[model samples]
Target: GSHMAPIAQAVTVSLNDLKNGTVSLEALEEAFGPDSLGILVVKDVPAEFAELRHRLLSYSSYLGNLPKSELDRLENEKAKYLTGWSLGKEDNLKGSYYANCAFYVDPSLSCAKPTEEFNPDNFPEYLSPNLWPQESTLPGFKPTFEDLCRLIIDVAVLVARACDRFAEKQIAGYPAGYLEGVVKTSTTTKARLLHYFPECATHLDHGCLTGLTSAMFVDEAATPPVVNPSVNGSLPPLGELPTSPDPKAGLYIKSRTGQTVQVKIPRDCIAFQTGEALERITGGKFKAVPHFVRGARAEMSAGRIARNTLAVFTQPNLGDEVDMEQHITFGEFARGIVAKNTVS
Candidate 1:
């Protein structure tokens, strides 16, 4: 078969070849274009962190399934508090305020010093249980939420360390000062973790690196075919599927018939992708991948079984510049994301 030899060669390649070399770069760029390399699939997440993913997904799903009436009620409550906070209201019952205890010799708590001039109408947003209906009512949601927070923090640390190691191995020729700065900046990096089921689309975060790890389900009937933009004058006929099939699924496009391809990503493996910020931070070393979701099929519609995912976006401190000290510039990073339209 035409594909047999190449498939065997791919299978027999060493892990080092797969990990260290840029073998897939050109192929990926040909298929998805130059920005494809930023997507890094991490398969080694420790088992101890499983519960964090589970909780995030579970809570997100629960929130998504809530009735419209409940959502409206929560939104209304939020608006009311916002209005009060803006007016500089000091009543604890009417407006929210933080309590601080400074150890000056006494253990008694004192009113936290207000950092800004009180404008009763200056209702800035604050984190509150009332923002989420289920969380507000759930007993453990408040007290035990720290576990999920810690999990996200731990994952960010792991990603930071990975980037650090990669830099050490690949950029050894760089000046020592430059390398030290990169390591310091990377080690202190931060990112937010989000979990969503079907119907939720995330807005991109501003950062040097955004990584996503997830498990997606696409059934025969549920999976929609993708059209190859390279053909048909860069735009496929509206309803036609792309000749190239999704790699995750073993499906292949049949050129002669121009029909559905059959392929599927096995249930166990995690999917990975990169975001705009990453392209900027790593310069051209990593390419940010842009992707979107497809609608559900008729069978999936009837069952309404949701697709679940765990996502972590690695970002630097807001004030930190995304460009590395080693000749990379933030302008170049911005240009890359803009050319791809990955960041708005």
Candidate 2:
């Protein structure tokens, strides 16, 4: 009885249902409740999303190809090299590029000076601005990256509103519009653009909810093909995309019942998974997702394959209380995670 059998599917809903507040409570329970896998797929996103996904995923490759000297400029020492353009810094996973979207989506915070309450000097990991390659070096990287990250947040907010309705009925004295309010206004929300060079690891997100775009696989041998896809793009034909070269290659979730589930978020859709903050915020009514990426296993040529995806972490504002009984704010909780990971 020790075999890990993959579930055939994960719970899926539509963007229209999320927008109209028609997602049923039962469906939310099946996707995120005590016995479920804690992830839900949102289908039928806007048409522009596909283009944005393609462009950004391609940019993951373009960003990786930058000269070492150029990359050094994008790296942030104050943020412990996690905030911008980092490679080989994340624990357990190496040779991946990271872009922190905190500064991209929050214009006011990126431009604002340090205050006693919010100082980038003290908490650079969450408060620092994003870094991008020069526009002349990589055309349209900044605006396109910002556009895609914002679109994911827009969809995540709709999902949060749906969750808000369900929580209101389940929890006594649950603040009205709680989840949606946190999602809509949090300057601490972050998006990580990951370019994976075939790797795997398991962990739960510390943020409230993470909106994930489907992974796009590119044959690195054919990369540097087109950095910008808006005009006469060089995107691969659908049939040639190794998006699922191996069935078990992408994302996997560990269910509440202790079974492993392989899940796919369709290219046109986004998936939102519950995280530790949300679980605590709701007092464990909703469980946090434990998931991992199982990189495609094949005896392929060296440096020939790359996987790209984006996860928009919709976190609470620094001042928001995550744990009701413990009275732990999101800022304090985040500091511990950052401190633990960045320790020398």
Candidate 3:
């Protein structure tokens, strides 16, 4: 609902350090603290990333607030992966727009058209055509989305390469080509634009969270209606957990030390977090992170609008086994979560 001071500073990495081989394995492990907060802020990306971020990130709120019927026009419920517009289909606190580069021999970051000729049925797995609002109604939004989608892909690759080297140096006898050979080149590359309605809370609590009494649309009409996630009702029948000071009611991340901190990605850089596949691959040496968002307190006394962010989920080819010993494919592990979560 209202802005509060950030609880912790995210670890940062510069593009030079990443691309030039100066990045450290220790830093990567610390940032992606599997037992802690699994996140990193990447700085000094291409200058174009700034514009791309602004243009694309704007869609988070714009798309999130679309008329219910309008958003449904873009939904693809039967798809194997997240495609088009998903309105809290996966996450109750977030609405997402998904895109990917899995089908391309040399994927272009562009969102509008593909570098290769269009082949609807021929597209690879884990990727599909993007769902979008009518161009005439939204004017410029799709093009902006496509452009932003492309740039995020570029950054994902760069980050993966850095991750590759980081693993190599940090873990002795680590598989030399796993990151580049599979993660970077994998066909499951995905980019997501997310919108989170702003929120807050009175006292931090992991057991419970609440939302604004009413919807504070990101639409131009109703904004600055502050909200918060108040810890109400009887306390959870458990001991203390972690929380952020500000808890801006946006992104919540768990630090390796186990404190729940608010996520604050500096405007100048992009941020990244770990996932289950990577953790499994590293034999649990790496951690994906236990993370979630804070719900908003919906009382009448609140201020703020919709919040938004974008992320690129990069992974090894879907067919490749993340656990070489157990031989579990990324898709296999993914399905378990998908099955438990999806309403469909």
Candidate 4:
């Protein structure tokens, strides 16, 4: 028994546990709980995951290397402000393309201004618009990213459902649908596609971070404005080179025994982590974890390399009360946070 992991070995679970309806709430809690480690890996997702992930992952490198002008042609405020290509800066993604939006949105709508019903002001970026690559520039770029987004959303739904079920038992006196309802049907399910362009790993890590529109919204909404507080916390684990037992490469987790071990997720596996909102909603039950990428050493990838990462932020309905004080709606809360990191 001593040999057994003091806690869950991986702080993770398998997709089979979900499909068979036998996933344990206890294990899920341990993996995502507030006081415990803040990350959970979902292994053995559908077989299509590897290829789907690779397609978009490769595009990031090409996108990263393009001359600023060539890239600027496709750029617009939607990405910076709404949902497309936002520049790198402090508080958001340090050295990556920030495409924060619902995938598969059409550029055709850009021809006309948003209608009163569209309510661009009230809605923020969630329903505002999307930016897609022209067919001439990058063939199938828009569709490919959207397809990937679609697949990840499906997986996210599975994780959300399981997380919801487990929370119901852990939380006492809440309505049956209170916790799970917001996560499942909420209109704002943010999907961020990040490409960390390799640079001086040690010094450039937190240097030169800047973005604008989101910052305004976020600053006003952020009571304290902690500016991506956990990014530094989360990414250290993902910056390492490959190692033993779990060589998924560049990702790590703290063990029960106070060890920092890399988390190896197989090609087919999909991992989910907590976000700031969830940590508050669950009263710190599932605190957000910090993770980063491609911290390759001198020997790996010639000592410098780029990393492609995808994060989907699932949230409750816009008007739901995410904060106990009810100072702001989840919509505004997310809006400000999204705005804080979006660059011009």
Candidate 5:
């Protein structure tokens, strides 16, 4: 079978358009349809994003440099180290650390009881409280992490509203504002703070949509020191860190029809990618993206530039239904993902 290659650029829309619910259906389709790469970039975000991004990314270096004993204390064995800090949590990539951000309570339901499926005693992996290093170790890590994740989720909700409009026209009797509802109401949503030392092997996100931040590359030997807010009146900007000069040192996605495409995220934009849950919920109108992260090439690898990024996965609640045809709940689909990844 011959493969078709289209342009490698990802479709983009302005954050204002998303805010006004004016995102075009054509743009949505071009980004998520079967024939296209399943990624969309949202440009012109709020000014606070830059500060939040820098602060959060700098914490990755702080977290990575912690003593093994300290990190071990943050690990949750019941969750198979999936709920908190862990290295090689999914892939066996050495020096990569993942801190799942779902530990923050849903603002919409912070005062309410969790749904049965998300009960912490029953599902610690998805419902446990977040673990943070002590304030003495990383002063602003928790707040910065939560702020960036919340901001990304807010953008994701707008993107979901666009998807809902597009899906309504494609599938008959699709619930109005369905995808937005899923993004807004879910307590199980997770944001992963990933610090890659260097392929994160190719993988598809199981959530409905993944909101991704741009990667920040910091040379290990010359990392900017984490500033102390208590002693300093103002935080100095993180000095220029070298982004990978190698063109192949970022995100790559395999298109639906089998061609590989490199998708670039602009320094000022956040990307939202389609996922398996969206594909199922939309009855295959939108396909999940299969993608991987490529580290710096050999020449750049000589200096050990550590790459840090965050991916906020907006997933439906466990009790929410994913496939109406099969009558499958999100809980059922997720358990299978966890089990398959862990067991032989």
Candidate 6:
């Protein structure tokens, strides 16, 4: 994917002007694209991010080309953390919550050592773990885990800003101050989904927005892959096709119409997805796109490493029910994801 074109030049307006009802969605749609939206890609992330990426890439290499094993490990760890968290045995609000997870990467990774006797800065003593390990088997790839954490936080903020803007626009309908009210009342949550797509498997998510940065280890032998929902029954009947000297055979439909739009984030830019909450808040004006991962082309067989993507799933505050001044209700949005075992 390539970088988005420059934001078109447009009249500048103030937040107050928007609050005072001086702007309209038509003007915003004119300035932004027909989507009535802007994709802000912050370039040249702090040096810390590059270093962190290098570290993570190295870690991925160390884990080798197996995704299922890594995913299983991650799930186990996540479950353990969540279980402890729900039992109130872990302090979810403290930095230690994150530190405990980081420890899984390297047990010796400590940026600072904290003790009950430590009281110099009056900061929480628990936050003073020793710096992350600077020495890894991968030579020349040493980065303080602190730097990695900072990078993740930076990316989280970027996604939060996008979600914040979407939320505000849904409430007030675009232009200047649309992001202000939402930012004021809204809270953001971020999660990282590191995915490795084998030749014939897929992945999908239930969330408001998704941001991804991926690297391909193998060339795409055919057109880009597609994502579709999982089906439990037999495959559909095939349609007629004309024979050719070399038939092009990689195109597959992954998503149904009115489901989701999948946009590849530029190599240097961030990608964002619209979520269900945003769709409801906008009274179906803004769409919440559903997407899936698709299998690789037949030419690209199993064991051929193709792509590795790090996705950031951006979410609104869990406790806050999504309701806009426009009068959309959360009950309507809740039905989509609810299990079918019981009906309401």
- Over 86-188, each residue of candidate 1 has an lDDT whose tens digit, in order, gives 1121111111211111111122312112224322122222112223234333334322233433443344444434444454444544333332243233322
Higher-TM-score candidate among 1 and 4?
A: 4
The most accurate candidate by lDDT is: 5
Tell me how far the alpha carbon of residue 86 in candidate 4 is from the true structure, in angstroms, after superposition.
3.6
Give the runs in model 5 whose Cα sits over 4 Å from its true position.
Answer: 1-7, 89-114, 198-201, 224-237, 240-242, 337-344
Question: How many backbone overlaps does candidate 1 show?
Answer: 20
Ten residues in sequence with the least summed lDDT for candidate 2:
231-240
Question: Which runs of model 1 end up more than 4 angstroms from their true locations?
Answer: 1-36, 73-136, 142-146, 169-206, 211-272, 324-344
Q: What is the lDDT, from 0 to 100, of the residue 41 in candidate 6?
A: 34
TM-score of each: 0.46, 0.86, 0.69, 0.67, 0.86, 0.45
lDDT of 2: 0.73
Ranking of all predicted structures according to lDDT, beginning with the best and ending with the worst:
5, 2, 3, 4, 6, 1
TM-score of 1: 0.46
**Tens digits of per-residue lDDT for model 4 on 113-181?**
334433556564555555655555555556666666656656556666676676577766444545445
Q: Rate the local accuracy (lDDT) of all candidates.
A: 0.32, 0.73, 0.55, 0.50, 0.74, 0.34
After the best TM-score superposition of candidate 4, give how far the Cα of residue 33 lies from its true spot, in angstroms: 1.3
Clashes of 3: 23
Which residue pairs show collisions in model 5?
none
Model 6, position 128, has a per-residue lDDT of 31
